[PDB]
Design a protein around this ligand. Sequence first.
Ligand SMILES: Nc1ncnc2c1ncn2[C@@H]1O[C@H](COP(=O)(O)OP(=O)(O)OP(=O)(O)O)[C@@H](O)[C@H]1O
Ligand SMILES: Nc1ncnc2c1ncn2[C@@H]1O[C@H](COP(=O)(O)OP(=O)(O)O)[C@@H](O)[C@H]1O
Lengths: 272, 250, 242, 244, 273, 238, 246
Amino acid sequence: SISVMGENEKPDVTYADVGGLDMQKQEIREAVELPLVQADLYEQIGIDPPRGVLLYGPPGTGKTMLVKAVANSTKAAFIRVNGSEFVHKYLGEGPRMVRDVFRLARENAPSIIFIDEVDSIATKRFDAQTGSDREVQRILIELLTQMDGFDQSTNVKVIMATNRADTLDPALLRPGRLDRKIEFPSLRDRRERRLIFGTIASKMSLAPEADLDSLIIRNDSLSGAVIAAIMQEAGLRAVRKNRYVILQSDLEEAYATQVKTDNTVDKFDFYK
Amino acid sequence: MTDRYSFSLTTFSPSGKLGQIDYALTAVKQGVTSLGIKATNGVVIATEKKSSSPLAMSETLSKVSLLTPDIGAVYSGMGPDYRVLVDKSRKVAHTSYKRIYGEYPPTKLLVSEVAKIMQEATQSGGVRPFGVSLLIAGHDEFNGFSLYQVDPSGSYFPWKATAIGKGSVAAKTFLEKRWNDELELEDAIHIALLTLKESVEGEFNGDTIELAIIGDENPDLLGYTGIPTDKGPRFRKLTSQEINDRLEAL
Amino acid sequence: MSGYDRALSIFSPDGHIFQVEYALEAVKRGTCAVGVKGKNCVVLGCERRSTLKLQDTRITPSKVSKIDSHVVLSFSGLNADSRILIEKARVEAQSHRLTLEDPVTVEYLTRYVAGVQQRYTQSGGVRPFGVSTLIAGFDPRDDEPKLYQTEPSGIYSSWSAQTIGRNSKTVREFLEKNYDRKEPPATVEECVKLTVRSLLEVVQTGAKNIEITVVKPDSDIVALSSEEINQYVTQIEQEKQE
Amino acid sequence: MGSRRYDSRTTIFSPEGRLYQVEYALESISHAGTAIGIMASDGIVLAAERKVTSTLLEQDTSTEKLYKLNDKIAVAVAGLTADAEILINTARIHAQNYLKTYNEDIPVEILVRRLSDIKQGYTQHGGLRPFGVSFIYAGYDDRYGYQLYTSNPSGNYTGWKAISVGANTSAAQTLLQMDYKDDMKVDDAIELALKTLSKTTDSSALTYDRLEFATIRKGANDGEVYQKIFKPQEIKDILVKTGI
Amino acid sequence: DPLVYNMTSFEQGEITFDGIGGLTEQIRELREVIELPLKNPEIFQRVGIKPPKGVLLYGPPGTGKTLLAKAVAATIGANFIFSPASGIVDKYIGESARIIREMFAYAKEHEPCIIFMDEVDAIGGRRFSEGTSADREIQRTLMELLTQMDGFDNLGQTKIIMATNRPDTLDPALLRPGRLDRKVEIPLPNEAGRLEIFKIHTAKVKKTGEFDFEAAVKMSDGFNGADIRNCATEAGFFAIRDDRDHINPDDLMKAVRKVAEVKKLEGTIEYQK
Amino acid sequence: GYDRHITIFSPEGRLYQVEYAFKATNQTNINSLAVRGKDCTVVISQKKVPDKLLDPTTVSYIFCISRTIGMVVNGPIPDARNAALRAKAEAAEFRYKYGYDMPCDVLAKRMANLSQIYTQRAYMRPLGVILTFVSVDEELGPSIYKTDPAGYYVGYKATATGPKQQEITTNLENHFKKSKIDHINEESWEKVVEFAITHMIDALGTEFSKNDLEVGVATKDKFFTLSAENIEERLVAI
Amino acid sequence: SIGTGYDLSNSVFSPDGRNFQVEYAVKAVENGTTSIGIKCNDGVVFAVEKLITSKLLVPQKNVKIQVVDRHIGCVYSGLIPDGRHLVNRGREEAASFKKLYKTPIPIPAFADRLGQYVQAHTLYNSVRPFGVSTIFGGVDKNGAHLYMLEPSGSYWGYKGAATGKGRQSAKAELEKLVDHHPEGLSAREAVKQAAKIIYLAHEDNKEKDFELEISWCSLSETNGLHKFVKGDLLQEAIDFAQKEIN
Ligand SMILES: Nc1ncnc2c1ncn2[C@@H]1O[C@H](COP(=O)(O)OP(=O)(O)OP(=O)(O)O)[C@@H](O)[C@H]1O
Ligand SMILES: Nc1ncnc2c1ncn2[C@@H]1O[C@H](COP(=O)(O)OP(=O)(O)O)[C@@H](O)[C@H]1O
């Protein structure tokens, strides 16, 4: 039988230990826990609740993490599952593994589940000419009906996650199954980075005698996970010189440490 | 000797989309950025070179090039497959139109014959297409100022304000907002200029860039003064300080 | 493939040559046709596959196709290739009439256009003529009727009747039953009711679909009127009463 | 050389007895635009539904789904326009050759059996592709009066009454197969066109920029026909007279 | 499975850093990162770091990285496992990948303990839109790895290091820092960097002559980091074949000259950035 | 095809073949360099010699094609000479037809434009070479140009070539940012030579003879190699 | 270029920039007869191992040498007929030179022709390279020369030469000889110094006997023309070189 998690552990993070992406920090809320908590106010108008969603973007950008604080703030039952274990040696182990999880949800409902990655088991064609790659499609079809077949549940729906958002069927990507899609781009806009650096930085030791705008405006094409590395590495620009609290030039010594690898790969002999 | 009249590119894949064409313009998008737009009274084209190493001179390699005193063009794609066909192109304007009539050609049909340089190559035996999708700007009297894009197939479109290359889509997404139906020149070049600067890092030095226009005649350059039936060359590019003083404005 | 002898050249281990038997394996997908020679007349026939009543009725490019007053041609299958053989035959007619000061035979004609195809399948950088044709008409000042059938392999073989294209084997067995080298049909209308009747198995009584000429001595060539045809289409069906 | 330059797949057959490059080409067009052509008793028309409609794309100077041959014949092109400007350059001479030696204009049945016979010419000879194209025609004479034809990339031409090409067409015929009478004045023909095109395409909005068409008539009694391509303003007139 | 219960062979055994040359700074770039969490973890909490998780190597092969992959075992005394990125696949789908869950948990039940993983280019693809009927299997086998190191399942107090000879072709989603927070290249070193490596073999076996290196090593601008152990033995391999069992600097020369061209005839294939 | 011939690209949007032709240029582990002057230029090319049966007067990578012009090759020889020969034959045309001698720029507007034609019509493989030129023209002064298997010919302030055209340059561009001159002084055709040799040995640090190196200088109505005894004049420094 | 590769057809740069359809050839010539080329201080001299492959062969009947117009000696190796081909081009073009410029042919500009005709059989797809390793050396007002030939066209100017299955053997002596004679020998004496090679080189192939032939060209002995040598000269040599190697 598949598993479930309460308070043996948690991810041990928070909405406050994260920042930015704030418009995504509310679209997610109204789908999931507010319906679970605040029910009547929209049952004043009784429309069917929105339900589980998708969320994509380039690798990183918190595509996998944002769950973790809301997970900490769930007040319902919840899981720890990804995609590429549904497969099994035998044939019917797969689909049999997965029919019951909704029963497990329904046996413990109201609750919700999650997947960290799905693109392995979701593609456009439900390819045909091999005894193997149909048995994955059966794992796709079964949820595709258990999601929004007859009489599914009260719950919100299987929360996706990917690095890509075109490979997979529209039959799954349409209302009643994925009523919201979400992008997580970074873009290096200056409205937010001036926080989330500080968010990541305020939690950690920091010398109030130091530059900080030495790089923000200086760099404009950035992502969200790497940036921890520079102000991770900034500390490591210190202890190598057995310094116990950081200094201003650590970041400048770090600025090109993580990023500056612009372009040298066969420049002249690229195309011409 | 050369036993390979076997027609390359003549194999329609079953979907109906050709093979190398959709691969050829896979290059030009991987190529550098350019653009060129239009106004009521003048025209402009520009791009940037990316020397890629310091010591190499960056004024001999003229990416923009002349083909008539009233027409001028640029690309952004592959280089060496550009400078060969202009030499055919400008030769045509002497041959197909001038020697037989006397005049220089309009641009409703120079582009047509430049296209015919191209499709005769994607259809004969063992010949790749030219990895360029250039664009020309010219002036006439039945139609005056005008603009044209081409593509390595041969399909020429007309246009009003366009970019092609690396981040052209971002620029085509950019122009049309702050574009205007009567953006005359000295603001056109500005919006044109900044239309590139977003598309670039490294350095935006005045020497980094070339550009040019087709405006009004300038018989200070015509040299052979003493003939009222010899108008001025309507085409003329610009140097690297008169660009670099519209640039100090921003 | 200038030259290159792609697979037309490559014989088979069985002996055959692939692209040729392939050709007239493709020909049967096109409109049928038919020929007959009786006592004094010669007759031809084709069909029009059913359109939506838009296939332009006036100037349709038809199956019979004259050469002179005394020769015609019908064919089967491909059409863009048909139009050149019709040209580079009648070319030789106007030529043969000139440099010999007298017109063509038919045993001179089928030899040519059956020999031409052999050059379009025993040369390089050439595809065969995916087509099969027949010739029909008299020699000059002679009562004798002749038709010759020819096909892309290059062989020509005379006949008394024959059919080409689609569902011919559903047909020619009807003709060998009725038609016989014993004794022709008497005259024109005899051949036709015999001719038309043989089609009917693949016809769905589309009288519009089928189109007919005849050929007569002294080169009295003619095509016939849908009414004249349709009033055979019915009285022949009036005979169905059993 | 031969063993590795695949010059064999051209100009050869299937074992099931057919061609690939042509059934591909005939399909390859259907990704492209759309056009129609009919035959009114009074005169002739055409039309073309582009798809290239970027707003700043100039689409008002001249046209590309339509061309001319001479002062009495016109067409409606479909295909890729790198493979249209050549045979047309070989057509326009032909009239200026036919007149040049017989001082009259073309019996229009003759030239399509001069244009088709170069399209066929490549799909038998050489190892070359065909012209990936399909055409319409529209012309007038005296030994047949009015006419209308249709072609193919192989070289198989056909005379037809009222036709569509390109995309999504097999219903288009079936959308009009009821509506075609034979009386067919002109001004009860164009109503069919928009009634045709405005029920098949992307956006029923159908900006005039996304549309072209032409017309033929007999305006001078005992005189030639009036080739007239319509231009934006007068395109827009009938576009809104219908009330849409 | 029992196969996880077979790999662990020399989880401790110390072959220390004195037996290595050329890499006195990479190890300064690496003794930094690994041991410190596993020595003094409160520093990253003293200072406020999300600690690292993941490292790798790159550079051409036969170069000494696998030694480094084990030389850290000597410093720690703590545990270790060796394993490839090849002997994982099999017929039954998932069985290859299930193992990955079987093992990270197996780390958690006894540590300080870390992981090595060779030749990851086999599991180092860019996730393709189109595929074969089966090559996507490794991709779904991969992303479990892509998950488990940073997935929803939190992790701490274990480490992974991987290595290739082909850094390209990799799914960038792996290369997300957080999944590995520092890179490094081990090159073929300079002559002096090639010179400590030369003498360590003499440091063990019975030397007889003076140095006689600087001109010998003048030829050493061609070798790799690992052909010299062959070279070192190859001198005595036939110094003795004349039944002269006391070696010289006379005989290696015939060897070290020889190896270069037999190495040449199938050498310098590629370098992979 | 798509990885064997040239006249069909990859699916990606480039090709693979010609990218190799650049690579065989390094199939001789040779380095070269070239510089400027008010009236003078220099070119040099280190010379290897395996088995000593050769006639080192016969060995040469250099081909003074004409007066006013000079060139040296890279990569292998036999695929270079045919690129040199029609060059020499061409100057029997531009002169006989357009009056006077070829500038370099028209030449490296030409000798490349056909190398492009050798990669459309693939019957002739592209020439396995990158290639340079020198001269002392009359308008623009001592000019250098580079050429290549596909033709992004470029003028230069100086050059660098071999397997090690990354650091030899770095030993050169170090001070053309300092000295603030594309030009270089010490105009006479000797002093500029030591400049070429001192900065490279500073980048390499190896001693030489007349045996193993060479010379080539562009001068008015002149171009030639010579005797390299002036290796000595570096000696006076330290 | 191991299989599913590039070595099979010409003019396809293997990704290390090589024509592996070429370097198969130099093994062919390496699987052929031996021959040499030597620079006298006043001219040249050549040699070759003629190969008895049977008893029914006639001395001085079937040579393994051809010749240029008047002076330029030329030898073969590896495959003969492909060699014999371009030697017809050798005598050909030099007449086009002579008729035009009114003189005999210089040797450097000569290779400028013959070092391209073979190069121009490398670059197409529908041809084969000459599977040989030719030598030609001669004389002129500027002195004398010697030129070895490789199929890719990598011809240089040597003072001593070798080929065949006995190269590293033979050419060693040519190096071990010349250092003892920086003078540069005259003609008659280098002859026997070279026949020393072939009766030493054949040590590989002691299953059989053989014989040889000799060239000759110098200023003091022919006015600088090519020929062979007969009578007591080479007979005094073959026993001499055979005498001093036992
Ligand atoms: N905006 C942010 N705020 C706080 N932390 C961030 C942010 N962006 C990135 N991070 C840090 O980078 C890491 C990002 O992990 P993330 O959830 O992006 O995994 P992921 O790569 O999206 O997963 P997958 O590859 O399955 O999409 C987190 O561990 C977090 O510490
Ligand atoms: N720096 C070095 N010091 C000592 N031995 C080395 C070194 N580099 C390589 N070797 C030799 O290489 C072999 C294995 O090295 P390894 O780490 O596997 O390199 P690679 O992974 O490139 O093969 C051992 O036999 C070892 O002696």
